[PDB]
Design a protein around this motif. Structure first.
Motif, PDB file in Angstrom:
ATOM      1  N   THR A 104       0.843  -1.178   0.000  1.00 52.20           N
ATOM      2  CA  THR A 104       0.000   0.000   0.000  1.00 52.20           C
ATOM      3  C   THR A 104       0.883   1.235   0.000  1.00 52.20           C
ATOM      4  N   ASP A 105       0.275   2.400  -0.189  1.00 53.36           N
ATOM      5  CA  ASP A 105       1.018   3.653  -0.117  1.00 53.36           C
ATOM      6  C   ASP A 105       1.777   3.784   1.198  1.00 53.36           C
ATOM      7  N   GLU A 106       1.176   3.371   2.304  1.00 54.80           N
ATOM      8  CA  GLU A 106       1.865   3.532   3.576  1.00 54.80           C
ATOM      9  C   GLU A 106       3.056   2.588   3.691  1.00 54.80           C
ATOM     10  N   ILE A 107       2.926   1.353   3.188  1.00 57.91           N
ATOM     11  CA  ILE A 107       4.045   0.427   3.193  1.00 57.91           C
ATOM     12  C   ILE A 107       5.163   0.961   2.326  1.00 57.91           C
ATOM     13  N   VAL A 108       4.840   1.462   1.132  1.00 64.53           N
ATOM     14  CA  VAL A 108       5.868   2.006   0.255  1.00 64.53           C
ATOM     15  C   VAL A 108       6.553   3.195   0.912  1.00 64.53           C
ATOM     16  N   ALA A 109       5.768   4.121   1.489  1.00 64.90           N
ATOM     17  CA  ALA A 109       6.355   5.301   2.096  1.00 64.90           C
ATOM     18  C   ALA A 109       7.277   4.943   3.249  1.00 64.90           C
ATOM     19  N   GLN A 110       6.888   3.961   4.043  1.00 64.99           N
ATOM     20  CA  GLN A 110       7.756   3.517   5.118  1.00 64.99           C
ATOM     21  C   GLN A 110       9.055   2.933   4.578  1.00 64.99           C
ATOM     22  N   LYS A 111       8.974   2.099   3.539  1.00 65.06           N
ATOM     23  CA  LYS A 111      10.187   1.528   2.959  1.00 65.06           C
ATOM     24  C   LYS A 111      11.088   2.619   2.407  1.00 65.06           C
ATOM     25  N   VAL A 112      10.528   3.592   1.695  1.00 70.00           N
ATOM     26  CA  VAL A 112      11.341   4.654   1.124  1.00 70.00           C
ATOM     27  C   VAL A 112      12.053   5.435   2.218  1.00 70.00           C
ATOM     28  N   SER A 113      11.322   5.769   3.279  1.00 71.95           N
ATOM     29  CA  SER A 113      11.895   6.518   4.392  1.00 71.95           C
ATOM     30  C   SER A 113      13.069   5.769   5.013  1.00 71.95           C
ATOM     31  N   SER A 147       2.584  12.237  -2.260  1.00 72.61           N
ATOM     32  CA  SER A 147       2.496  12.897  -0.965  1.00 72.61           C
ATOM     33  C   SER A 147       2.593  11.892   0.177  1.00 72.61           C
ATOM     34  N   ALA A 148       2.164  10.651  -0.029  1.00 71.14           N
ATOM     35  CA  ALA A 148       2.329   9.632   1.004  1.00 71.14           C
ATOM     36  C   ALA A 148       3.796   9.402   1.282  1.00 71.14           C
ATOM     37  N   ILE A 149       4.603   9.336   0.228  1.00 72.36           N
ATOM     38  CA  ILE A 149       6.044   9.197   0.403  1.00 72.36           C
ATOM     39  C   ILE A 149       6.612  10.432   1.073  1.00 72.36           C
ATOM     40  N   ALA A 150       6.221  11.602   0.594  1.00 68.71           N
ATOM     41  CA  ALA A 150       6.801  12.841   1.090  1.00 68.71           C
ATOM     42  C   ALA A 150       6.533  13.053   2.582  1.00 68.71           C
ATOM     43  N   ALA A 151       5.428  12.544   3.083  1.00 69.57           N
ATOM     44  CA  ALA A 151       5.060  12.717   4.486  1.00 69.57           C
ATOM     45  C   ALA A 151       6.060  12.084   5.436  1.00 69.57           C
ATOM     46  N   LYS A 152       6.820  11.094   4.989  1.00 73.64           N
ATOM     47  CA  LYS A 152       7.796  10.416   5.836  1.00 73.64           C
ATOM     48  C   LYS A 152       9.238  10.845   5.605  1.00 73.64           C
ATOM     49  N   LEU A 153       9.481  11.826   4.747  1.00 74.80           N
ATOM     50  CA  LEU A 153      10.819  12.268   4.397  1.00 74.80           C
ATOM     51  C   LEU A 153      11.078  13.678   4.905  1.00 74.80           C
ATOM     52  N   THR A 154      12.328  13.946   5.214  1.00 75.17           N
ATOM     53  CA  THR A 154      12.775  15.314   5.392  1.00 75.17           C
ATOM     54  C   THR A 154      13.272  15.850   4.061  1.00 75.17           C
ATOM     55  N   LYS A 155      13.466  17.159   4.003  1.00 73.94           N
ATOM     56  CA  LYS A 155      13.894  17.785   2.761  1.00 73.94           C
ATOM     57  C   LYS A 155      15.220  17.229   2.264  1.00 73.94           C
ATOM     58  N   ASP A 156      16.174  17.014   3.165  1.00 75.86           N
ATOM     59  CA  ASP A 156      17.482  16.528   2.739  1.00 75.86           C
ATOM     60  C   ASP A 156      17.397  15.132   2.119  1.00 75.86           C
ATOM     61  N   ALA A 157      16.431  14.313   2.547  1.00 76.61           N
ATOM     62  CA  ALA A 157      16.287  12.959   1.994  1.00 76.61           C
ATOM     63  C   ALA A 157      16.005  12.968   0.499  1.00 76.61           C
ATOM     64  N   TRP A 158      15.419  14.042  -0.028  1.00 77.92           N
ATOM     65  CA  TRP A 158      15.057  14.068  -1.438  1.00 77.92           C
ATOM     66  C   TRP A 158      16.258  13.990  -2.352  1.00 77.92           C
ATOM     67  N   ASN A 159      17.453  14.281  -1.854  1.00 75.07           N
ATOM     68  CA  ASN A 159      18.633  14.119  -2.678  1.00 75.07           C
ATOM     69  C   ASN A 159      18.869  12.667  -3.056  1.00 75.07           C
TER      70      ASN A 159
END
Length: 249
Positions: A104-113, A147-159
């Motif tokens: 799900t979106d939440e599982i993906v966002a957690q993995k990305v984070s 946005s689900a992914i972005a909710a678990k990231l800080t700005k620096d992580a986007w690099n």
């Protein structure tokens, strides 16, 4: 100008030792003269073989999935295990995993984070289904997933993040998106990142297109201003992947 392009090969659940040795030799003998990051994502069991044989300096190896932590998860491979063996790229949230394997979106966002925290470069996959496109929900869907992914990231992580827009209806079907269709979505995504994360992040972010890319359609996709390369399935198992790379010049 555009950021550094990426040409990524998702081999999916394919390969034998003999076929991989031949294909890696083809990739090694192709001299790449421009600035591009090439990525190959073999199955887990083929990672050591590809590490041993791949020598082209423009390539890195990626995993096709991972879980965040080691432990009592029979059958899975964790991010710390991948790092220890020298793999620091991962594809996360591919449509096949969202569809068949319950991501799900939440599982993906957690993995990305977690991947970002552990120092990975991440190719995060988003995209709409045919039903969603025909309901005129494409923008809502891809922005929700992002946005689900972005909710678990800080700005620096986007690099460390690369987004891959793969319309589900284009994956493996032969029905590539037109350059105008892809550009419309990439522009929408880059604008969302610019307003919600930062204009500096948005200018450097790679947004890849995937879904039935081949050597003949790649150059007309890459001509669009917000397309930064490709995530390639079926055509990455063939020698014509060389011309997909060269279409990012």
């Amino acid at each position: 100008a555009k950021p550094q392009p990426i040409a990524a090969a998702n081999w999916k659940c394919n390969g034998t030792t003999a076929s991989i040795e031949k294909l890696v030799q083809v990739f090694n003998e192709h001299t790449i003269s421009h600035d591009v990051q090439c990525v190959v994502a073999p199955t887990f069991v083929h990672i050591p073989l590809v590490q041993a044989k791949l020598r082209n300096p423009k390539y890195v190896i990626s995993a096709q999935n991972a879980i965040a932590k080691s432990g009592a998860f029979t059958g899975e491979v964790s991010m710390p295990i991948l790092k220890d063996i020298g793999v620091h790229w991962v594809i996360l949230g591919h449509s096949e995993r969202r569809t068949y394997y319950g991501e799900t979106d939440e599982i993906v966002a957690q993995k990305v984070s977690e991947a970002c925290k552990q120092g990975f470069m991440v190719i995060a996959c988003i995209g709409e289904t045919l039903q969603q496109r025909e309901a005129n929900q494409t923008a809502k869907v891809v922005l929700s997933q992002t946005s689900a992914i972005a909710a678990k990231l800080t700005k620096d992580a986007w690099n460390q993040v690369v987004l891959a827009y793969e319309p589900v209806w284009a994956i493996g079907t032969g029905k590539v998106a037109t350059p105008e269709q892809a550009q419309e979505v990439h522009l929408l995504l880059r604008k969302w990142v610019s307003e919600n994360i930062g204009t500096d992040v948005a200018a450097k972010l790679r947004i890849l297109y995937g879904g039935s890319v081949n050597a003949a359609n790649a150059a007309t996709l890459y001509a669009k201003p917000d397309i930064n390369g490709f995530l390639v399935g079926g055509a990455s198992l063939k020698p014509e992947f060389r011309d997909i790379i060269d279409a990012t010049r």
